[PDB]
From a paper:
One using the phosphatase-constitutive mutant DesKCSTAB, and the other with DesKCH188E carrying a phosphomimetic substitution, both in complex with the REC domain of DesR. (D) Cartoon representation of the DesKCH188E:DesR-REC (phosphotransferase) complex, along two orthogonal views (left and right subpanels). Note best fitting with a one dimer DesKCH188E (chains AB) to one monomer DesR-REC (chain C) model. The β4α4 loop in DesR plays a key role in these controls, remodeling its configuration in concert with DesK-association. Taking into account that phosphotransfer is a nucleophilic substitution at phosphorus, the reaction coordinate distance (i.e. between phosphorus and the entering atom, before the transfer reaction has begun) strongly suggests that P~DesK→DesR phosphotransfer occurs through a largely dissociative, or ‘loose’ mechanism: a reaction coordinate distance of ≥4.9 Å provides room for a fully dissociated metaphosphate intermediate. The phosphatase/phosphotransferase transition, switches the distance and orientation of the HK histidine side chain with respect to the RR aspartate, enabling for the distinct reaction mechanisms to take place, and ultimately ensuring the unidirectional flow of information.
The simplest TCSs comprise a sensory histidine kinase (HK) and a response regulator (RR) component. To address this question we have used the TCS DesK-DesR from B. subtilis as a model.
Residue numbers in the entry:
A (entry chain C): 0 to 131
B (entry chain B): 154 to 239, 243 to 327, 332 to 367
C (entry chain A): 155 to 329, 335 to 368
The structure:
Amino acid sequence: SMISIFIAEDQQMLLGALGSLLNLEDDMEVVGKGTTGQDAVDFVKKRQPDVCIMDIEMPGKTGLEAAEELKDTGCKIIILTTFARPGYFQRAIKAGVKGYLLKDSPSEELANAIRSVMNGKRIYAPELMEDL
Amino acid sequence: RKERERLEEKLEDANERIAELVKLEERQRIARDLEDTLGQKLSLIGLKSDLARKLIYKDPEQAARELKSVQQTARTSLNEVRKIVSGIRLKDELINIKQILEAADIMFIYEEEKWPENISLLNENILSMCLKEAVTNVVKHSQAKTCRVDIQQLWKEVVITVSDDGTFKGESKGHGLLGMRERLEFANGSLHIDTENGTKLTMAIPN
Amino acid sequence: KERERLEEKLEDANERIAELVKLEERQRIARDLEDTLGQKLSLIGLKSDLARKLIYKDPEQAARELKSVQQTARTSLNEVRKIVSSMKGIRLKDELINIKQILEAADIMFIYEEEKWPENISLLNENILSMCLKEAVTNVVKHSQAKTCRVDIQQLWKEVVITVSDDGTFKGEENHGLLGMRERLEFANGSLHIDTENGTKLTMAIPNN
Ligand SMILES: Nc1ncnc2c1ncn2[C@@H]1O[C@H](COP(=O)(O)OP(=O)(O)CP(=O)(O)O)[C@@H](O)[C@H]1O
Ligand SMILES: Nc1ncnc2c1ncn2[C@@H]1O[C@H](COP(=O)(O)OP(=O)(O)CP(=O)(O)O)[C@@H](O)[C@H]1O
Ligand SMILES: [K+]
Ligand SMILES: [Mg+2]
Ligand SMILES: [Mg+2]
Ligand SMILES: [Mg+2]
C-alpha cells in the first residue's frame, strides 16, 4: 500500500526538504535518509525499500555507482540532478535507473514519477535527454 | 624599417591568443563554482518554497521558518555572485555616462585602459559622484557635440578632466560646481574650471 | 642552482600577468551575471519576506506570493543551466560531429574508428583540442585537395593524442592556424608535429591524467 522511500542526498538542507516534501503524500513514507552512495547500497540491500531517491554527485560512491551496485536488487532507483552533464544520461539508463529527474522539478511531479516507476514505467526528464 | 611593426603585431596576437586561454580557464573555474554554489541554492529555494506553500495551513510556523531560509539563501546567493570579485565603482559610472551621452547625441571620447585601479574606495566614490555631475552639466547646459573624459595617475593624485565643445552658460550654494569643489576640497582635492573653448573641469583627489 | 631561483622568478612573473587577465574575467562575469540574475534573486528575497509576513494576516496572498517565488527560482535556475553550459565551451564529441559534416560537404572521405577514447580530460584541454581539431580539418578542406582524411583520437599513456592525416599535397613553404595550434597546445604543455611528405599529417598531444 504505502511506498517506502530511501533518500540519498549529500546536501543536508536538500535531503531534509525532500523528506518533508515526500512525507506529505498519503501513500508514501521516507524509511531512511543518507548522504553517500554507500548509505544507499547498505540500506537498500538490508531494508529493501520500494524506491531509492538518489543524488548523483555524493562523496565516496556516486549515486550512479550506487545504482549500478543495486541493479539486480528489486529496488526502483530515481536519480535526481540539478545539471544535465554529458554521459550522465547514458550511464543512468545502462545502470537501469527507473527515473532520472531534475532536483528542482515541482514536488507534485516527483511524487507522480515515484507512483509511475512503482507502476513499472521509466520516467526521464526531457531536459536531461542528451538531445535538448 | 616597419618590419618592427610587422613583428610587434605578430607578438601582440600571440600574447592575445594566450590571453584567451587564461580567460577560458578562469571561465571554466567559475562555471564549476556556479554549478556548485548557485545551482544548489536555487534548487533549495524551489523545494523550500514548494514545501512552505504546502505548510501555510497545516503548520504555518514551519512555513514561516522555511521562508526565512529561502530569504537567507537568496541574499547570500546574490552576495556570493558579487563576491566573485571583491573593487571599482568608477567603471560603473563610466557605463552610466556612456549611456547618458549617447542618449543626448554627444560623442563620448574616453579610453577604458587608462583608468586608475588603485585609489581608496572613498576617493573613488567621490570621483564617481563628480564625474556624474560634470557629465550631467554637459548634457543639460553645454549644447556640445563632443565630450572628453581623461583619467590620469599623476604622482600622488588621480586627476579627471571632463571637457566639452559647447558653450559655457554660467555667470552657487547647493549646486554642482561649488558642491563638487567643496566635497573635493574636504578630501584634500581640488576642482578647476576653464570656460574658454567650451567647458573643461579638472578634478583631482589624493592617491 | 641559481637557475632554480630564476625559474621561480619566471613562474612568479607569469602568475602576476595571469592574475590580471583572470581579474578582468571575474569582473566581466560578475557584472553580467548580476545584470541577468541580480533582480531575480532580490525578487525572491522580497516575495519570500512578504509571504512570511502575510502567512497569518492573508494566507491566500502568502500562497499567491510563494507561487511567484516558486517560478522565479525555477526560471533563474534554467538561465544558470544555460550560463554554466556556455561557459564550459566546445566539447570534443561535438567537434568530431562538426568535422564529419564539413568533410562530407567537401567530398572528402572521413576515416575514423573509436579507439582508446579519453576517459577523463579537463574541460580546458578538451576545448583546446576541439579548437585544434577544427583548424586541422579547415586546413584540409581549404588547401589539401585531398580525397581522404584520417582522424585518430586516443588516450595514450598520460596524453590525449590527435592525428589528422590527409592524402592531398602540402601547399606551404619549408617553414595563422599552424602557429595558433602549436602555441595553444604548447601553452597546455602539449605539442604539435607535422609531416608533409605523403600529404599532410598533424600529430597533436595534450597532457591528461
Ligand atoms: N558643461 C557646461 N557647459 C555649459 N554651461 C555650463 C556647464 N557646466 C555648468 N554650466 C553653467 O554653470 C551653471 C552652474 O552649474 P551648477 O552645476 O553649479 O548648477 P546647475 O545649473 O547644474 C544645478 P544642479 O547642479 O544642482 O543640478 C549652469 O547652470 C550653467 O549655466
Ligand atoms: N592540410 C593542408 N594541406 C595543404 N596545405 C596546407 C594544409 N594546412 C596548411 N597548409 C599550407 O600551410 C599554409 C599555412 O597554414 P595555416 O593554417 O597556418 O594558415 P592559413 O593559410 O590556413 C590562414 P588561417 O588558418 O588563419 O585561416 C597554408 O597557406 C597552406 O599553404
Ligand atoms: K506519509
Ligand atoms: Mg550532490
Ligand atoms: Mg549641475
Ligand atoms: Mg588555416
